[PDB]
Amino acid sequence: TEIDNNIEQISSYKSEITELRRNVQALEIELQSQLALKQSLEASLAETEGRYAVQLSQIQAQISALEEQLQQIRAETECQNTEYQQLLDIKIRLENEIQTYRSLLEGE
């Protein structure tokens, strides 16, 4: 009966090998699935980051335009400060000069 014990032990090893193989298949599949998920999360991360970077880029464009116009307006304002000052010098010159003639003829 010893040899029979050995034989039924061979059917036992068969059984165990089958089971271990099924486990290996299951684990390969699970590995696939997990990798899949990892990749889709890489995708989601790229989505998130890209969307935020875009909205930031829109706003930054607004800051660029605004800074631009601001600079233009300030430059214009400096030119007009200049023109204004010239006009004021001229005015005061003509005014003082006239008034000198007037005061003279009244007072001489």
Binding site: L20, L27, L94
Partner: protein
Amino acid sequence: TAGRHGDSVRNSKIEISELNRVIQRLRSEIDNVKKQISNLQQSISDAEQRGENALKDAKNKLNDLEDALQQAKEDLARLLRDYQELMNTKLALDLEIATYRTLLEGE
């Protein structure tokens, strides 16, 4: 026959050892991918909070700039009305001068 039997038992046992090491390898790699996944989720949330902070900072900057723009415009408008006034005055004086000049012309 002895040989064939020793061989069957032995190659079965060794096949089992083999299978058990690859099961361990696989479980280890699944653990790896799960940790990577965890890191990825944390990195997503992180990217979100970072992005939102950036948006907020940029919006504050822009708001300040809009206010600065409005102020510069008002400065310029004040300057322009002042210039209009000044010019009117100067034109009056010009009138006086041109009258005296036209006087010298006829002589």
